[PDB]
Amino acid sequence: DTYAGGQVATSSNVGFLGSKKFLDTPFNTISYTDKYIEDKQAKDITEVIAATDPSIYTNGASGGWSENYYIRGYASSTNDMSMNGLFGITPFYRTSPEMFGRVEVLKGPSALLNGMPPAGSVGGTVNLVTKYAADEPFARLTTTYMSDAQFGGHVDVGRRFGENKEFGVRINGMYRDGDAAVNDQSKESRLFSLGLDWQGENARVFVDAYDALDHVDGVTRGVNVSTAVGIPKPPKADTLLSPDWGSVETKDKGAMIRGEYDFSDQLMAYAAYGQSTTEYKYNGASAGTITSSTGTLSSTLGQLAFDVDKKSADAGFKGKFETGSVKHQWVANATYYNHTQDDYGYRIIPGFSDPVITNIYDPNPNWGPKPEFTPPFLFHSTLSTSSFGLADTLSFAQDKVQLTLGLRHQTVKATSSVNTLPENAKSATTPGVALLIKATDKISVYANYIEGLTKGDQAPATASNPGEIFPPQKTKQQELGLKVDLGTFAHTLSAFEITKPSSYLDPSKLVNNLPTFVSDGEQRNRGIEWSFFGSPIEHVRLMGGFTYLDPELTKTKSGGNDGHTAVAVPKNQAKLGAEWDTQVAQGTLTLSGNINAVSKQYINAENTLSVPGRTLLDVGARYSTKVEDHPVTFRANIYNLTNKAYWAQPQLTNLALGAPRTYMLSVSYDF
Amino acid sequence: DTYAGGQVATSSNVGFLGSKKFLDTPFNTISYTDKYIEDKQAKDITEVIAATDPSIYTNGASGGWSENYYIRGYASSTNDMSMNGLFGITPFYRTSPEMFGRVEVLKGPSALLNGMPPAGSVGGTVNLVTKYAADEPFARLTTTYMSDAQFGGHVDVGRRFGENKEFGVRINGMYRDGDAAVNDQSKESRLFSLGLDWQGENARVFVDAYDALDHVDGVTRGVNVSTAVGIPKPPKADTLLSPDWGSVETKDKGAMIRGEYDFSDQLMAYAAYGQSTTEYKYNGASAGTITSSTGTLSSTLGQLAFDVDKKSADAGFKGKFETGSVKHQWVANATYYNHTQDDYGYRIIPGFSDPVITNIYDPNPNWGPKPEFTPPFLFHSTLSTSSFGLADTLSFAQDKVQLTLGLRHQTVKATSSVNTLPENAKSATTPGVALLIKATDKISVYANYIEGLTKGDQAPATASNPGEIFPPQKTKQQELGLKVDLGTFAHTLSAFEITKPSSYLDPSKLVNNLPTFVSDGEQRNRGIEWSFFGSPIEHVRLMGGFTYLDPELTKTKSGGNDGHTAVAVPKNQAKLGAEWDTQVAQGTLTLSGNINAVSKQYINAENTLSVPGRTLLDVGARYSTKVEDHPVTFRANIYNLTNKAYWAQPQLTNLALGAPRTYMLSVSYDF
Amino acid sequence: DTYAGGQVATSSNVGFLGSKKFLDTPFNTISYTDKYIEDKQAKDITEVIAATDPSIYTNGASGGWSENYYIRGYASSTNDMSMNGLFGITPFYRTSPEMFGRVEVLKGPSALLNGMPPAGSVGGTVNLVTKYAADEPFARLTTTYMSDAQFGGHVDVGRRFGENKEFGVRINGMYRDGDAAVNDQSKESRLFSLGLDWQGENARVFVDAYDALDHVDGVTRGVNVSTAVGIPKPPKADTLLSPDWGSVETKDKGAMIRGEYDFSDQLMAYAAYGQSTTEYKYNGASAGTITSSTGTLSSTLGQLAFDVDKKSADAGFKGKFETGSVKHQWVANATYYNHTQDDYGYRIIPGFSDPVITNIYDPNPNWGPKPEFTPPFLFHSTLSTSSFGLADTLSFAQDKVQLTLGLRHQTVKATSSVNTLPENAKSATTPGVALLIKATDKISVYANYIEGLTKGDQAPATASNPGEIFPPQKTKQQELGLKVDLGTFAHTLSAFEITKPSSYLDPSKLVNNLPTFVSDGEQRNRGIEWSFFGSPIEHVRLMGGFTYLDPELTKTKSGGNDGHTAVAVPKNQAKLGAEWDTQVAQGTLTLSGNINAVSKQYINAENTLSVPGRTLLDVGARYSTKVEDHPVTFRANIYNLTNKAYWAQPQLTNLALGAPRTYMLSVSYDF
């Protein structure tokens, strides 16, 4: 199932259409292997999916309170990742990748395929495929270092049981802690995971469970800027511009079960259920504001905690039949997601309401005393979603022409203990259509129309349409593409247009002489993408590509920012990762390099503040051998080799510094 | 005509004496190949000629408004380079070397050979030999990167035409743009060149034309220091100490034609004609001054633009005959150069006359707003030069003794539309003599006497001799040397004394109670040079040397600085470039290193300010292979790999920082 | 005598017990070869012994006025090294290792074996074994570079003479000079050494002499901190926090002779005599004090010079006898050491009495003018020590059980020309016992009890017991260990407890209503050490280990700091140095890496100030080949490759910055 090079897989999960090969998939998809994850020494999902993919963008900060990435120029929430196709299971804000065999990306919205995930983001879907036991007993220990002083280890063990190895047990354990590459920042991660499976004659069961901890001392919050003051030059890249005493901690625990039942070679049922809990806590700056061009920083302090309990389910049937010369491959499913949440916080900490005044260039800032962590209860909230979907792929000529049609009906309801307005469920129906034509055994041409959904907002009691809750809001994509598999090297070329609506109270629009809450806002992202992966020549691997994006705010409240460029994202990206192997003694030496080049980004929707493009370099070396026939692999990587200091836009604040030059070492041994 | 290693050629153009071999040339000469240029990833001529040559010195700044180098301890102006032996064609201030097959240096003055080039510099002559089409059709594409974010490409394509391939067309095109290695500095270069030739039975014609752009944003101008304040420690090497908004742009366009006609095997005529235009624009600091030992910098702003139209010609006869046992090879020529120029500028920019105050160590200097570029017309100027030269080389004893004798008459006139003083042409006659003895077929001993000319200065209205224009001023060299070609490795050892006059207003010589303008000043440069090139053992290349230079101010105004050491140049240099090849899979891996070690330099003629010596290291790797039988070469270079911060003296200001650690990558493919 | 890998030897000198093998030595011992020394490009003894040994700690500053290291958590003075077993010969404060064949370490105190060395330090003994002529004539030249601009060379030549090569001459000469890796620091070293030997039938003579110079401009003195102000973040690693004009120079000259006479195979005599002189001069800061969290530094200036003339001797007998099945090997000796010293200095320099005020973060501090060096004579002083010792090693059960017993009687007297208090000799008697069991041919278990001695302090005139001189003070060790020699790889596991007394004025213990001077203080170091060396698989070398140390202040003045952790030393260390060889062309390429990880250290005995742990990385490459059958080796090393900035505790002041990233190159050629 692995492509030449061993770092990319040949198939991925296409939502409820299930597993499909590269040349059969009328969507821009990529699937990274666990070998790739270990080769990058990836510490989070971003470090897997953003490194070579020009359609993914991260601000690249070290030690933030979550991962942050865009796909096709739109936010793709960490909340919205799937685990083996099921949403609401994965860690809330950051995921260390040790428990995954594959990390899959499907670019653009996918409501027909996947329904509406909990945060309603539309950029793309990240699907994490868990590890299960291979046939041969397996035990691998890996030790890790990351500068300045973060040490860790990871154990991965598998074995199968029973007369026909019908049972599997796969366990991963990981711990790392210590000072990171940013001053006064330390990063602690912990994971324990279990992947269990039973393979029956007609039936199969897969069970996954994990317990995770993510903790950052000296967490990065980022800083705000104004047009009056402007953006000063970035301090050196290892500067921490949030309180040294600030910290974030997230505990995630999840479990899921999937069953499959083969009625025949033409019909199968499946059911999946899962639950997870998240406990988040944050004590630190709510925002730092740069109040002078000389680097004065005024930081207000805040505290936040929330606890959320999630449950999710997805069940259905898949079948196939041939009528005349036409093959039908169909799927029908029903999905459910529910969460209950409690929020706690201080906007103003009692006794700590004065801002802390520092300077961003000070080598020795005084962040003052740490406020005790005691945020009071604010409100209880719930979210409930359900869907049911149907799709059919009609094919002829041995699958060389494939037309997919489907619909999904989606419902959503939200509640909050402090909302006084009506709370009602709302629904929408979302279609999709895709066409794929195989020009040759190597070339597929495809097109799709598909939507993304986002929970509707609620009009205030003051509106002409008072208290109206909008139905799920449709993001719309059209895409045309071309895929070429030359054998050991593969290309994808695609062009897309995606429109995403937004809602606001508009006093320019009266009904009954009252302001109307409208869904009249729009962002439109047009893009063209050329990407590639594999081995173009023997002993060489290349992954990367080029994108041009036009992310336009086409319609904004009062028209003030109409035609402006969306914030945060660059219009242009070029990424290339290369590896070259040489046989030396009794093993393989690999040298690697990465270049990541982006153009400028706007910091505000007025487009009066921006930060420039930047190009980052990475280099690495790997040595793979056997010691007494035991596989051993040594890895060394330097990220941000030039130690470029740059501003980029995180969530919730205007700017954060990009990660500094970072050294990583690992050694693995197979018992 | 390539020496072992492929990086140095075995002959060069010895002004109007034409092409001569290494062991037949009674001057210290070196010629670099286009292979060497590509191997260094040279971006300008300095990066070719300074890297390994201990008789050439550069201050080594990144993104200056021109190149800056000394030869034998005297300035050698960028204005004074020749193209295929003709002056006034090459780019005015910086030349990217993609259109040249050779870059040739002749060390020391050469007025007999070359006449007086436009800026009257005397250190040495740099001759750029253009590319013409080889017999086999040729196409090479190269992609380039230079840190942080400069990307570019270069196409080189040649083909010959006609039944006997008597016509050739060679085209180069190059573009690169983006952030350089210095903070807030970006470099843009563009070149399009055409090399055309026709080879007849008794005649030959060569045509060359190019269009070039050089543009730097965040141009480095340098800073001034005083004895009262002193020289502070250098900021980190990637600091820009000129306005971040400052920029320079030079557009150069040139064309030349050379024709030769063979009357017989004993007589030939030749003629060369060319023209060029330069359009220069600068908006930035005119100088920074360090006004405190805390690092306070006061930067006055200025603007300059000039447009210059140049024409140039060189025509003559060459012949040979024998008288008894003596062979004669003689040449007679006439040369002409004319330019017209318009200057525009502000010494004091309206609204920007106050200097911008920063600190050299600040990470966030405030350079203020960028002034609009509207410099008014100042004056029209012209420069005209002409010469008539004669030389004969007499050969005795089967060409083992070669005596060259010659003289040249040189005229020069300058005008300015705002000069009120008389304008008159002035002339001088400059002789030369050189003797070469071939001790063996491998060993040559040589001596020369030769001069360099510089336009005479004009006495100011305040002098006893007001408005007097001095004739062209004679720099005088005597040299003794030894050359040894061992086969695949060669040595040169030479010793020289060069005296250069200077003119000034002298209050110690009163005539009618007024100071007299005199041509009494002198600098005397004495030196010893040992250098070498080639392959001293299999799979190794080695090029470099050692120099000692004693650049003394022997006569100065009022005797105040008599016996002091000249500014800017080091007394000691040691340079070594090494390469080592080894077979790796199906290709050749080359590892390279360079060291460049110099001693201290004085910053003022009083010798009360100095900067220390520094040692710079470079490393590189190259991999040459084939992909489907197409030659491919990968190149990686790190210059200033330790990222040493150092001051050195540029033109017009006292100090500028040396270039920081800089990464360069390239990939070439032959079609 | 060399272990697998060539970097460690299989035996070492165990004080007067003489040469013993690894598995026969009931002490934790290691001996490094001259090959290891050249492989590290070690510039001093610290760079040999601390790199991989987790029981040795250095603060790691560049260009201090001496080396500074701890063994088993106690100071081990540079003054206390032996040369071929003799104390008082080696350079006083820093030793460049070019003249040594072996650098041996014995961990923990060793008074029975070694007596009391001149500074009375107890952490361990470093024994430097000089080079003598091998049988085959030898001549090696090595050139060196160290960043930024330090160049040097080293010649090593040997030849033997006489019909049976019974005479040997071995000469080393080394010079290096230039700018080092710290800002405004330059390092000059010089050495000339001679090793002569005569091998007779029943007698042998060895003579050694050397003349050395160590000079640092921009010497690092370190800085003081208070609890009121605290420890600010370290400036960048290449910062010099002492005067740029400050300098230190030490000249050391030494010579020794050793003679042996074999009366029979059961009895031998030996005698060793030596002398040395040291001339020390220091002009610079006496201390800098950090007086604000903004980085304000107040430096007082001082001058010190001292001259010391040393003489030393060690003579005895060794023999063997048997009592039944028990073999006896015994030794008896007498030792002597005397020095005379003159001290000169200013505590307050006339004209320079005001402190110099700088800031630690200033890139351009103003250190003011350099005071002339004229320190006046202060006082004459002397130190005299003598001992007599006896030991027997009883070997039972075919040498599988080896019991060593002995005692030594030690005397010491000090004088000073400005002391008015009484001056009297004092004595002590010190036992030692060690047991070694060879469990197999590969495995040894051992235990020891042994002491270290330090000259007693003298009670001040203010005490109840004024002028009382305490006898030599007993440091006491118990140790248990395990050694395993697997063949080409070896392990040591040891545990120790060492108590060291200290003396102070106790205000709680009144005699005649006055405080009493007592020898009641104690530090107790408990530790566990796991270390290893050799070649665990072909083409790989690995050296390093892990230690846990508990250095507790068990008894302190007034009980104030009882139970606190001792200053300066970390509780945890992990070190690993690895090398990997592969054939490239006609030679061997070695890649090397080192990691050095330590935990936090306390800065004061109150344990209210500390500095964090740090982890340092080093890398290197070596290429060994032949050119025309002459051995040539190229070496490249980068130390502190991440350029980590850290504080650690030097001698006499609270803090000093660790050495920055440092580049080293060398090339050797064998004639």
Author numbering:
A (entry chain C), B (entry chain B), C (entry chain A): 33 to 703
Can you quote the paper on this entry?
The apo structure of BauA was solved to a resolution of 1.8 Å by single wavelength anomalous diffraction (SAD) using selenomethionine-labeled proteins. Residues 33 to 703 of the protein are well defined in the electron density map, while the N-terminal region comprising the TonB box is missing, presumably because it is flexible. Compared to the other TBDTs, the extracellular loops of the β-barrel form a large open cavity bordered by mainly short and apolar amino acids giving large access to the loops NL1-NL3 of the plug domain. The asymmetric unit contains three monomers arranged around a threefold symmetry axis reminiscent of the porin arrangement and thus plausibly biologically meaningful. PISA, a computational assessment of oligomeric state in the crystal, suggests a trimer with a high degree of confidence. Biophysical methods (gel filtration and light scattering) do not support a trimeric assembly. Size Exclusion Chromatography coupled to Multi-Angle Light Scattering (SEC-MALS) analysis in C8E4 is consistent with monomer whilst native gel shows the protein runs more closely to a dimer; however, the detergent bound to the protein may increase the apparent weight suggesting a monomer in solution.
